[PDB]
Amino acid sequence: PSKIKIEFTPEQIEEFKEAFTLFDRTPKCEMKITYGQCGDVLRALGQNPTQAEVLRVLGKPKQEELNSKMMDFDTFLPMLQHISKNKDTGTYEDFVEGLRVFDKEGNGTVMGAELRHVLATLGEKLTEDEVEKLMAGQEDSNGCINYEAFVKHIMAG
């Protein structure tokens, strides 16, 4: 559905084009990112789409198409324009409620090992490396997480 109206200022487009160069892994600097790089670019620019939402803008790509397929800034810009047109990303209260499902006692704390396992098995499975890096020094003296704090934490930055 590449037929989208670009409602970004001439300023906005230049700022995105500037972050875009940083992901340019090409030898000759032909200003192209792979299809696999797209998700990381959207994320760098402020959006937090789901794996599924990214594959939706990428027109459901093949495995060795994510690694081989190239895209210029002009084909990337509508993708960012569409992704930014979704703001039902979940409120703070929604996230807290989602994690409060694992607080077996309702004290406001979930076991650190439990939250890790949840993020790595349910929904869109996160890698052991992704959850290690994300749960880095987040656990208290008891090795458990204040999920209201973890939510505030991930929401900011």
Place this chain on the structure above:
Amino acid sequence: DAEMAAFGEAAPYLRKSEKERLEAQTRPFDLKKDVFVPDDKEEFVKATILSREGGKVTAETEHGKTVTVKEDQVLQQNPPKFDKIEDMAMLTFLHEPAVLYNLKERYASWMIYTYSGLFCVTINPYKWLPVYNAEVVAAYRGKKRSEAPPHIFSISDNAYQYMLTDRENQSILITGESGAGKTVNTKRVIQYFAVIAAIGGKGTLEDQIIQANPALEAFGNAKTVRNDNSSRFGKFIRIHFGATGKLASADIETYLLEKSRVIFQLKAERDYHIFYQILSNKKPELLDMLLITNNPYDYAFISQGETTVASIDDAEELMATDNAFDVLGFTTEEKNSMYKLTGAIMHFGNMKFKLKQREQAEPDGTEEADKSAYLMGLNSADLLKGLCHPRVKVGNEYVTKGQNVQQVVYAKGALAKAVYERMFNWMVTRINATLETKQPRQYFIGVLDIAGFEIFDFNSFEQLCINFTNEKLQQFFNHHMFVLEQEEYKKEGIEWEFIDFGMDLQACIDLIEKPMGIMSILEEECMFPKATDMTFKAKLFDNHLGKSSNFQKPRNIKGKPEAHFSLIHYAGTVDYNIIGWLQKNKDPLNETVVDLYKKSSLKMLSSLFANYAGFDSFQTVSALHRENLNKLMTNLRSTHPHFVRCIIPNETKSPGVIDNPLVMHQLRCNGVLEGIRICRKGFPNRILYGDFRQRYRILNPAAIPEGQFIDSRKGAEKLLGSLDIDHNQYKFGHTKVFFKAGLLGLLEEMRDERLSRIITRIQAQSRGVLSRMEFKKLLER
């Protein structure tokens, strides 16, 4: 297949394919024409209305026979979309032929389980279907009633789900007439938890729970007319779980074993399986150890009825029994002690007595007495001297009593029943010992498998105890479904009209258990030594004929055995024979012989009688039975019950054959239709406001803002109001939210889905976080 792929080869026996489903929704059907009309033979028949003149409808049956009937008679068929429905509480027309035909149609497709609102119905297939494998166990695991077809594995999971959510003990109450499928389903509930446990003594706890039943059945089950594997004792199995729902432990409580069977058999029945399994000569060593022949007709105690059953391979079953003991970790000494005592019982009945020349018994030979005493670690002379001349205390000395032949014959029988019953209790205590772990318990799921309702040509004390339990359990269902249910609605201030479903058996139960009742009169009569069978019969009649509606004169038939009264039970009128209830109740034993048993050289035997005491103590069989039954019932009252109603299809053990009047009689006396009506008409699900707010705030947190105190009821009102649900499906009580049928299930589907969306949007933001960290690094270099 799609959703049905997880079940494998079982899927066509659980849920019909979409391709099969749509073929049904195109079948010919006219709302007006296509109906149900009664039949004197086959209860009800499908028909197409031809014409009607004078409130007399004419139509053609499914057998092609024209007939004309009145007003009430004609009942509406349910449209083809409802064909083989999984929950009958979801049918547009709920009446007797609609329930019967939905069961018949499903059964015809070998779909034996059907939901009936909050409970389940199952019809005996008389055929083993590929629906009880580990692949199916895994397929049902965690599924909600919606995403999974009816099955005992489903009932089992739903019971486990409520256990962890409510942090409360649950019970699975499997009802049915002798032959219906209670034991079959009890063992499948056990299989479910044991298989699940195997995923995340000699065998493991799971192998031991599974092996507990083949062991007890060898000794406590027997072939009767209605069941080749009848349960002659009732049991309650508690499957214990830890806080996280991990299998911890299990325990078995057994109830009144049919002691009579050990030494007595009616025309069409066998003694306990074990006798014939041993006699199979599969393990020849057992016959050499037991000093027995391979012929049951050489053993008077066991050869009165039948000795072989077509459906039973006693050689294969002996192997099953012997292995069950190995898995439960019984020692060789323990196993052989049970075998030697079974053989000793066999020899005991072959002990013959004659009168001393010129009214005292003396042995008519000693060969079988020598064999019995050898196995029982006794001196044969002491045993024969002890049976013929028992010692009775004369204050500060001991005087021997005389015994005629009938008295000795009675005594050897009684001692044999005592050894057997006590050896059974030993085995239950021994099994419980292996099943007891050091592991912690939070809750349990108790399964109840009672001896089913039976009617023989000869009904005695044994049958009254058995049928009394069935009556008591049926009334537990009635009280729970129709009494408490409606009292809850009123208690909570839910606008409700009380409904008399005509499901109350208190009248009958009272005739049996209450003071001056059958059991009370029997227990009172046990106190008087002058009392006879006729004095008891006289007391019963005086106190109840023309006074207690359920107590009637016997309905005796020419050639068929004598009866003394007829009791109108829930499942039918039973003609009882009161001969020998007094001896049966007091159960007197020759204490001189019981003393030789205590001083036995067989470790097992002395242990069975060490504790020995009993009188007319002053505790009777009926008194202890009423006591244990009330203890069961009040303990079940503190559990969340789940009912499984087993229906026997026919009296010929024929697979796939339904006897319309027999299936109908069962659906009526069980109150299946009434139980579906209360689910439909009432509010089957309900949750405390605190628990509702907790569990479903996730569905829309904005309805219950986090800042302020929101009254728990106003929170529930605004939350449910905010949802895309039918706002007529819930009502507000003083302490709970009441839900019309199916709303809780939808709330759970909505919750499961919403939870997964949140996890993904949490993970989406986590991904955004990890990526922006790596972007900051790019900005550095």
